[PDB]
Design a protein around this ligand. Structure first.
Ligand SMILES: [Mg+2]
Ligand SMILES: [Mg+2]
Ligand SMILES: [Mg+2]
Ligand SMILES: [Mg+2]
Ligand SMILES: [Mg+2]
Ligand SMILES: [Mg+2]
Ligand SMILES: [Mg+2]
Ligand SMILES: [Mg+2]
Ligand SMILES: [Mg+2]
Ligand SMILES: [Mg+2]
Ligand SMILES: [Mg+2]
Ligand SMILES: [Mg+2]
Ligand SMILES: [Mg+2]
Ligand SMILES: [Mg+2]
Ligand SMILES: [Mg+2]
Ligand SMILES: [Mg+2]
Ligand SMILES: [Mg+2]
Ligand SMILES: [Mg+2]
Ligand SMILES: [Mg+2]
Ligand SMILES: [Mg+2]
Ligand SMILES: [Mg+2]
Ligand SMILES: [Mg+2]
Ligand SMILES: [Mg+2]
Ligand SMILES: [Mg+2]
Ligand SMILES: [Mg+2]
Ligand SMILES: [Mg+2]
Ligand SMILES: [Mg+2]
Ligand SMILES: [Mg+2]
Ligand SMILES: [Mg+2]
Ligand SMILES: [Mg+2]
Ligand SMILES: [Mg+2]
Ligand SMILES: [Mg+2]
Ligand SMILES: [Mg+2]
Ligand SMILES: [Mg+2]
Ligand SMILES: [Mg+2]
Ligand SMILES: [Mg+2]
Ligand SMILES: [Mg+2]
Ligand SMILES: [Mg+2]
Ligand SMILES: [Mg+2]
Ligand SMILES: [Mg+2]
Ligand SMILES: [Mg+2]
Ligand SMILES: [Mg+2]
Ligand SMILES: [Mg+2]
Ligand SMILES: [Mg+2]
Ligand SMILES: [Mg+2]
Ligand SMILES: [Mg+2]
Ligand SMILES: [Mg+2]
Ligand SMILES: [Mg+2]
Ligand SMILES: [Mg+2]
Ligand SMILES: [Mg+2]
Ligand SMILES: [Mg+2]
Ligand SMILES: [Mg+2]
Ligand SMILES: [Mg+2]
Ligand SMILES: [Mg+2]
Ligand SMILES: [Mg+2]
Ligand SMILES: [Mg+2]
Ligand SMILES: [Mg+2]
Ligand SMILES: [Mg+2]
Ligand SMILES: [Mg+2]
Ligand SMILES: [Mg+2]
Ligand SMILES: [Mg+2]
Ligand SMILES: [Mg+2]
Ligand SMILES: [Mg+2]
Ligand SMILES: [Mg+2]
Ligand SMILES: [Mg+2]
Ligand SMILES: [Mg+2]
Ligand SMILES: [Mg+2]
Ligand SMILES: [Mg+2]
Ligand SMILES: [Mg+2]
Ligand SMILES: [Mg+2]
Ligand SMILES: [Mg+2]
Ligand SMILES: [Mg+2]
Ligand SMILES: [Mg+2]
Ligand SMILES: [Mg+2]
Ligand SMILES: [Mg+2]
Ligand SMILES: [Mg+2]
Ligand SMILES: [Mg+2]
Ligand SMILES: [Mg+2]
Ligand SMILES: [Mg+2]
Ligand SMILES: [Mg+2]
Ligand SMILES: [Mg+2]
Ligand SMILES: [Mg+2]
Ligand SMILES: [Mg+2]
Ligand SMILES: [Mg+2]
Ligand SMILES: [Mg+2]
Ligand SMILES: [Mg+2]
Ligand SMILES: [Mg+2]
Ligand SMILES: [Mg+2]
Ligand SMILES: [Mg+2]
Ligand SMILES: [Mg+2]
Ligand SMILES: [Mg+2]
Ligand SMILES: [Mg+2]
Ligand SMILES: [Mg+2]
Ligand SMILES: [Mg+2]
Ligand SMILES: [Mg+2]
Ligand SMILES: [Mg+2]
Ligand SMILES: [Mg+2]
Ligand SMILES: [Mg+2]
Ligand SMILES: [Mg+2]
Ligand SMILES: [Mg+2]
Ligand SMILES: [Mg+2]
Ligand SMILES: [Mg+2]
Ligand SMILES: [Mg+2]
Ligand SMILES: [Mg+2]
Ligand SMILES: [Mg+2]
Ligand SMILES: [Mg+2]
Ligand SMILES: [Mg+2]
Ligand SMILES: [Mg+2]
Ligand SMILES: [Mg+2]
Ligand SMILES: [Mg+2]
Ligand SMILES: [Mg+2]
Ligand SMILES: [Mg+2]
Ligand SMILES: [Mg+2]
Ligand SMILES: [Mg+2]
Ligand SMILES: [Mg+2]
Ligand SMILES: [Mg+2]
Ligand SMILES: [Mg+2]
Ligand SMILES: [Mg+2]
Ligand SMILES: [Mg+2]
Ligand SMILES: [Mg+2]
Ligand SMILES: [Mg+2]
Ligand SMILES: [Mg+2]
Ligand SMILES: [Mg+2]
Ligand SMILES: [Mg+2]
Ligand SMILES: [Mg+2]
Ligand SMILES: [Mg+2]
Ligand SMILES: [Mg+2]
Ligand SMILES: [Mg+2]
Ligand SMILES: [Mg+2]
Ligand SMILES: [Mg+2]
Ligand SMILES: [Mg+2]
Ligand SMILES: [Mg+2]
Ligand SMILES: [Mg+2]
Ligand SMILES: [Mg+2]
Ligand SMILES: [Mg+2]
Ligand SMILES: [Mg+2]
Ligand SMILES: [Mg+2]
Ligand SMILES: [Mg+2]
Ligand SMILES: [Mg+2]
Ligand SMILES: [Mg+2]
Ligand SMILES: [Mg+2]
Ligand SMILES: [Mg+2]
Ligand SMILES: [Mg+2]
Ligand SMILES: [Mg+2]
Ligand SMILES: [Mg+2]
Ligand SMILES: [Mg+2]
Ligand SMILES: [Mg+2]
Ligand SMILES: [Mg+2]
Ligand SMILES: [Mg+2]
Ligand SMILES: [Mg+2]
Ligand SMILES: [Mg+2]
Ligand SMILES: [Mg+2]
Ligand SMILES: [Mg+2]
Ligand SMILES: [Mg+2]
Ligand SMILES: [Mg+2]
Ligand SMILES: [Mg+2]
Ligand SMILES: [Mg+2]
Ligand SMILES: [Mg+2]
Ligand SMILES: [Mg+2]
Ligand SMILES: [Mg+2]
Ligand SMILES: [Mg+2]
Ligand SMILES: [Mg+2]
Ligand SMILES: [Mg+2]
Ligand SMILES: [Mg+2]
Ligand SMILES: [Mg+2]
Ligand SMILES: [Mg+2]
Ligand SMILES: [Mg+2]
Ligand SMILES: [Mg+2]
Ligand SMILES: [Mg+2]
Ligand SMILES: [Mg+2]
Ligand SMILES: [Mg+2]
Ligand SMILES: [Mg+2]
Ligand SMILES: [Mg+2]
Ligand SMILES: [Mg+2]
Ligand SMILES: [Mg+2]
Ligand SMILES: [Mg+2]
Ligand SMILES: [Mg+2]
Ligand SMILES: [Mg+2]
Ligand SMILES: [Mg+2]
Ligand SMILES: [Mg+2]
Ligand SMILES: [Mg+2]
Ligand SMILES: [Mg+2]
Ligand SMILES: [Mg+2]
Ligand SMILES: [Mg+2]
Ligand SMILES: [Mg+2]
Ligand SMILES: [Mg+2]
Ligand SMILES: [Mg+2]
Lengths: 138, 125
RNA sequence: AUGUGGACCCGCCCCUUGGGGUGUGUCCAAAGGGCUUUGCCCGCUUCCGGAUGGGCCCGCGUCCCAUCAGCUAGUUGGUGGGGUAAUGGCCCACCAAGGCGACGACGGGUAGCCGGUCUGAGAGGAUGGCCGGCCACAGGGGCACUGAGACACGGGCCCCACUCCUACGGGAGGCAGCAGUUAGGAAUCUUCCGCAAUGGGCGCAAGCCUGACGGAGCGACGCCGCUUGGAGGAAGAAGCCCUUCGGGGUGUAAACUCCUGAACCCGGGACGAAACCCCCGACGAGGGGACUGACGGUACCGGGGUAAUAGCGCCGGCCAACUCCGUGCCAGCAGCCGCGGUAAUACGGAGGGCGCGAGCGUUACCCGGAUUCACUGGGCGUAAAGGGCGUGUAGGCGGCCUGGGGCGUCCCAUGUGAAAGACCACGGCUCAACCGUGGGGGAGCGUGGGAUACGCUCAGGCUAGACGGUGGGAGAGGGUGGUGGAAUUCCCGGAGUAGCGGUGAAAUGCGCAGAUACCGGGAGGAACGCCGAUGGCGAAGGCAGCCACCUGGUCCACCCGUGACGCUGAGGCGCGAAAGCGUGGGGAGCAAACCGGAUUAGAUACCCGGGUAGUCCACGCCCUAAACGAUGCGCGCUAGGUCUCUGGGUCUCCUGGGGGCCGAAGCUAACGCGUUAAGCGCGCCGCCUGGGGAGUACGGCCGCAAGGCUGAAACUCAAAGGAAUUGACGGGGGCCCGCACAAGCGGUGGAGC
RNA sequence: CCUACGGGCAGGCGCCGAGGGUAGGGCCCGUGACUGGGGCGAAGUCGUAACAAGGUAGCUGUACCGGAAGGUGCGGCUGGAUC
RNA sequence: AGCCGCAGUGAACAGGCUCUGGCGACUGUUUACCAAAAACACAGCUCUCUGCGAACUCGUAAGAGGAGGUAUAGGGAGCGA
RNA sequence: CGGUCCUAAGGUAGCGAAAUUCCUUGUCGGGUAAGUUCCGACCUGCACGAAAAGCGUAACGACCGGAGCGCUGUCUCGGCG
């Protein structure tokens, strides 16, 4: 049914990285890409190619992971430690340029859709705008 | 609960039951004694605690504790209520202020005199 | 009378809700008083503006109970009037039958609202007392008058109640104004001074009134500042404590010696005051002069000048501070956990110590901690919590592309958000509390412009969701009508004896009136052995011999059709094991109640023999449950291994839908869960908020009834609990030992000592 | 009565009207002989129902019965021992 | 919209109302001539007899009622929605 | 709760000073200024009790008891016609 596509993707990613894999797909969307467009440019991931799955257009998303640690649990650190949806379809979150977040005192990023396209916690403050606060990642 | 539910129901505000109603909300309450007796306490304890059944202003009648050692309270004694239960004595959530009306403070009290309504004694001469 | 002008009727013009203007008709005004008068001033009159203060209306915001669910006749709209400064159903006629409510109407309960205030990290929570804005009231009600304005605290009329005067022959009064009295109460003040200042009214102005106001008075009620002193002073007196009798403590503390010296004494003594007024200039400007202080001779200044109030709580743990004695579950402490039973750091006193200080405590109440109503910021397998299961209403939520609109949302700009307070810096009372000055701000809402990603909305298109077609599969899914065999029981016949039944052992019971056991015949009711499964079907309850008819759901292959038509779902509606109910049937077996036999101290039980309802059918109820996977529904995502049911295929295998087990990651308090999540996520509904009281009571709805749903409170307890751990125990299990039984021989228990 | 007289005032009747009266209802509070359970409180009386296979596995909805816990019937749950 | 009287169903012919117990469910029946009731009956419930030339009743009988009915029928009995 | 004697078995439910309760005008409560009756209770039921039914019941009644309002020659207490 998918009452929330965006969230589905975020979770689609969250569930892959947790088990460590090279790439997981996700249904194509103009709005969906502009979101991944942020993660690439912010290095949160590698990239993605508008691949195709049985006539249906998906988006093979490529994940980065830290260096193979040693000792008990050699599994590497996460490039994307945490990601959760903010403005959900059951509750939209709208903030002005003065009410913008502050993920991990700068150490993180926040993605929001505004009247000037898909921006960042920063760009929003730089541009001087504000809109629906999508999520947070670090 | 979904956020939708919260706009429907709303979170109900707790509210709080007063442990000292007979007072009617004020700190103290002038009254009058009716029966003065000694009652066996409860729990693991044992004794004969001095209590009083008090007819007060607000047409109420509750049991009140008489603190210290020895009192001068008869049947038609005037008195003042304090508030605060005993515990060992089920069904009695009010203390009696000493040295007021017909309640004289404990005689020969030297320690905590603030309560027990005993005034400062004379030292040497 | 005069009309600069104003008012209204009509036409006209512009604007455009009765705004401005025009024309024409009619209607409309006045006040004098004092003079250094013959000129000013103080006023009068109508108008158009200014300013200030309002009235009315509108959007949004504004508590508790749905255990208040339906409310309304001026009620809703109309027409036309009356009414007012004017809109209005405000009021009155008539017309129509409307208006309001789960977005909570109506009703009950509480409350004056805001600036602010308190707390809180925040968001929030609580609050509206002094000061300021608004509202309302002025003994309870009604009413109108006057007026610019009131339906008027100290104005009027009327009714009521209450009270007071009286030669009773009759009248009076309204403290929620300032003080004061009285009652109520845990409790809240002087029946003070002054109009000097500020403000107000009247006046040309002196001047006048001003319980507004400026002050003084009382109350540690609060915050703030201040004192009861400072230095020296012993190996450290006396006294009082402990003590192992050596000593330790109070303790520089005192004493004592010097030093200052708040209060008090004397003199001085205010800022707060300057104007109005008066003279000059014209009473304009200007300059000059003069007047007036309540607080009070008070603040403050000089000097003289005395060592001068200390109290309260605590010292078991939380929590800072330990000993002796007394006491002996007594007397007593206690916020919680708990202290006291002859050694109590927990009671009572003492010594000593900790903490504060003109205060220290207590009680009460608000926020905090409580993240314990969780927006920020929680839960529902077993701790409180998933509706018994579906269907579906409203509602919330919603897939890929593109365009219009730009509601939400976002930026900018502007208005408003007064002050006071708070915050920030600087000043003023010798500091501070207070106080002045100056500065910083939004949030919100109005207005203008802009942005369009997201939601929305309109438009168009799409196919991955959903539905439909075609052809097939498995199944105790359901309804109806039939029907088979086994067995029990009963009856009839034959044969046949002396007992059968039952139990731990028995008895009651049945049996010579011919039982049990055996054959044959017949009647009848319920239930369906092997297949059968650790299986299948259904939403749940639940469904099983076989047959037919009627009928639901569901799975696979084909990729053909529709083109977001979806998800969830408060109420509503429907289904809902057993027992139970009603009307009729039916009744073999079984079996509450009941009777008898046993056991037992008793045995209203467990066991045995009888046995009624019931168990069965129909129709109509009841609607509960350990209705359970104690796990709501749909969609997506995250290792696999093995067993089984059921499909499809090129049929070792792969692939779909189910049903179990072990398990990656992950979650979990743990037990455990884990592609059938209790994992990672979105949507929606239900429900939880300590245990007992209690699913009780009241009300309400439903029921023939039994009862069901909804569902509290007073009161009471300091816990109630979940999972797991070490133990102990078991009329639990396995293995094992001992003169522990058993096996065998002596005795004791009796007698005398 | 006064007129500035087709007037005003006094006076008269009427609508509404505080409220009083009569009648019948709704809600809530306090109280009541008697009655029901509930809570608490001491070493009271009676039995042993549950916790271990609690010595009849327990629990459960319903039904009947019994001094009391409880017993039994019907169906359900395992939150039940055991080789 | 008015007029008249103390008064207009102006004379006549027309319920007094409420609260609450007992008994009987109710309409009804009864002691002609002292009892109208809580007595009788009543729908309804249960027991019981009766297979049809029924049982039962009347008659010595014949005969008849039951009934030109046939167990959802008929007779007797108690209780009494 | 127990003991004992007896019986065919020892009165359950529900009512209960009752159309039944002698003692009796029981006792308490309510109505009244005052209530042998009335209503509501307790249970000590002389001598209720389940189809000669038990306990209730809306409606009904020229039945019987208790109370209040309205009204009166019933009455104070008669008088007049
Ligand atoms: Mg005009
Ligand atoms: Mg004139
Ligand atoms: Mg003059
Ligand atoms: Mg006003
Ligand atoms: Mg009008
Ligand atoms: Mg007016
Ligand atoms: Mg109008
Ligand atoms: Mg009208
Ligand atoms: Mg509703
Ligand atoms: Mg609304
Ligand atoms: Mg509400
Ligand atoms: Mg009200
Ligand atoms: Mg109020
Ligand atoms: Mg506020
Ligand atoms: Mg504040
Ligand atoms: Mg703060
Ligand atoms: Mg706040
Ligand atoms: Mg408020
Ligand atoms: Mg006040
Ligand atoms: Mg004020
Ligand atoms: Mg008054
Ligand atoms: Mg005004
Ligand atoms: Mg006035
Ligand atoms: Mg007045
Ligand atoms: Mg007023
Ligand atoms: Mg006054
Ligand atoms: Mg006076
Ligand atoms: Mg006063
Ligand atoms: Mg006073
Ligand atoms: Mg007093
Ligand atoms: Mg004062
Ligand atoms: Mg003055
Ligand atoms: Mg003045
Ligand atoms: Mg003047
Ligand atoms: Mg005066
Ligand atoms: Mg004065
Ligand atoms: Mg003053
Ligand atoms: Mg002071
Ligand atoms: Mg004090
Ligand atoms: Mg010393
Ligand atoms: Mg010493
Ligand atoms: Mg010194
Ligand atoms: Mg000196
Ligand atoms: Mg002088
Ligand atoms: Mg002056
Ligand atoms: Mg001058
Ligand atoms: Mg001057
Ligand atoms: Mg002086
Ligand atoms: Mg001096
Ligand atoms: Mg001294
Ligand atoms: Mg303290
Ligand atoms: Mg402390
Ligand atoms: Mg300590
Ligand atoms: Mg003790
Ligand atoms: Mg003891
Ligand atoms: Mg103490
Ligand atoms: Mg001692
Ligand atoms: Mg001890
Ligand atoms: Mg203590
Ligand atoms: Mg002590
Ligand atoms: Mg001390
Ligand atoms: Mg000490
Ligand atoms: Mg204090
Ligand atoms: Mg704090
Ligand atoms: Mg939340
Ligand atoms: Mg929680
Ligand atoms: Mg859940
Ligand atoms: Mg439990
Ligand atoms: Mg639970
Ligand atoms: Mg369920
Ligand atoms: Mg459901
Ligand atoms: Mg239900
Ligand atoms: Mg449902
Ligand atoms: Mg819908
Ligand atoms: Mg929608
Ligand atoms: Mg959409
Ligand atoms: Mg659009
Ligand atoms: Mg602004
Ligand atoms: Mg565009
Ligand atoms: Mg479309
Ligand atoms: Mg087909
Ligand atoms: Mg098929
Ligand atoms: Mg198949
Ligand atoms: Mg089948
Ligand atoms: Mg089938
Ligand atoms: Mg079938
Ligand atoms: Mg035979
Ligand atoms: Mg034979
Ligand atoms: Mg046998
Ligand atoms: Mg025999
Ligand atoms: Mg024999
Ligand atoms: Mg023989
Ligand atoms: Mg046979
Ligand atoms: Mg299934
Ligand atoms: Mg089942
Ligand atoms: Mg089942
Ligand atoms: Mg079918
Ligand atoms: Mg197709
Ligand atoms: Mg098409
Ligand atoms: Mg549904
Ligand atoms: Mg139904
Ligand atoms: Mg059922
Ligand atoms: Mg049944
Ligand atoms: Mg039946
Ligand atoms: Mg039957
Ligand atoms: Mg028996
Ligand atoms: Mg026996
Ligand atoms: Mg015996
Ligand atoms: Mg038996
Ligand atoms: Mg049997
Ligand atoms: Mg029955
Ligand atoms: Mg699930
Ligand atoms: Mg196959
Ligand atoms: Mg599977
Ligand atoms: Mg597992
Ligand atoms: Mg692991
Ligand atoms: Mg799997
Ligand atoms: Mg509770
Ligand atoms: Mg409770
Ligand atoms: Mg409970
Ligand atoms: Mg109930
Ligand atoms: Mg129940
Ligand atoms: Mg209630
Ligand atoms: Mg009820
Ligand atoms: Mg329920
Ligand atoms: Mg446990
Ligand atoms: Mg054992
Ligand atoms: Mg073993
Ligand atoms: Mg032996
Ligand atoms: Mg021997
Ligand atoms: Mg011997
Ligand atoms: Mg011997
Ligand atoms: Mg009226
Ligand atoms: Mg009235
Ligand atoms: Mg009334
Ligand atoms: Mg006991
Ligand atoms: Mg049991
Ligand atoms: Mg037992
Ligand atoms: Mg035994
Ligand atoms: Mg047992
Ligand atoms: Mg068991
Ligand atoms: Mg049952
Ligand atoms: Mg007995
Ligand atoms: Mg039980
Ligand atoms: Mg069973
Ligand atoms: Mg008339
Ligand atoms: Mg008439
Ligand atoms: Mg009549
Ligand atoms: Mg008549
Ligand atoms: Mg009666
Ligand atoms: Mg009758
Ligand atoms: Mg009757
Ligand atoms: Mg009759
Ligand atoms: Mg007759
Ligand atoms: Mg007669
Ligand atoms: Mg006769
Ligand atoms: Mg007679
Ligand atoms: Mg008659
Ligand atoms: Mg007669
Ligand atoms: Mg004959
Ligand atoms: Mg004959
Ligand atoms: Mg014959
Ligand atoms: Mg015949
Ligand atoms: Mg015939
Ligand atoms: Mg018959
Ligand atoms: Mg009879
Ligand atoms: Mg016998
Ligand atoms: Mg009895
Ligand atoms: Mg009984
Ligand atoms: Mg009774
Ligand atoms: Mg009596
Ligand atoms: Mg009496
Ligand atoms: Mg009386
Ligand atoms: Mg009386
Ligand atoms: Mg009388
Ligand atoms: Mg009589
Ligand atoms: Mg009576
Ligand atoms: Mg009797
Ligand atoms: Mg009788
Ligand atoms: Mg008898
Ligand atoms: Mg009899
Ligand atoms: Mg009989
Ligand atoms: Mg009878
Ligand atoms: Mg009766
Ligand atoms: Mg009658
Ligand atoms: Mg007469
Ligand atoms: Mg005569």
């Amino acid at each position: 049914m998918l009452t929330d596509p965006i969230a589905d993707m975020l979770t689609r990613i969250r569930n892959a990285t947790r088990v460590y894999k090279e790439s997981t797909d996700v249904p194509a969307s103009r709005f969906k890409e502009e979101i991944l467009r942020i993660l690439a440019r912010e290095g949160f991931i590698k990239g993605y190619e508008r691949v195709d799955v049985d006539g249906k257009p998906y988006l093979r998303v490529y994940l980065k992971y830290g260096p193979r640690r040693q000792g008990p649990d050699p599994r590497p650190e996460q490039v994307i430690h945490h990601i959760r949806r903010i403005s959900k379809p059951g509750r939209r979150v709208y903030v002005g340029v003065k009410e913008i977040p502050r993920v991990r005192r700068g150490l993180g990023i926040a993605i929001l859709s505004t009247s000037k396209g898909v921006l960042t916690d920063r760009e929003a403050r730089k541009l001087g705008v504000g809109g629906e606060l999508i999520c947070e990642v670090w | 609960p979904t956020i939708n539910q919260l706009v429907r129901k709303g979170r109900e505000k707790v509210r709080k039951k007063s442990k000292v109603p007979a007072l009617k909300g004020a700190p103290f309450r002038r009254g009058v004694c009716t029966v003065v007796r000694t009652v066996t306490p409860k729990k693991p304890n044992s004794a004969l605690r001095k209590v009083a059944k008090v007819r007060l202003t607000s047409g109420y009648e509750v049991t009140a504790y008489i603190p210290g050692e020895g009192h001068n309270l008869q049947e038609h004694s005037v008195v003042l209520i304090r508030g605060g239960r005993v515990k060992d004595l089920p069904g009695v959530r009010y203390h009696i202020v000493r040295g007021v009306y017909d309640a004289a403070g404990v005689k020969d009290r030297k320690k905590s005199r603030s309560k027990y309504g005993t005034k400062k004694p004379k030292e040497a001469a």
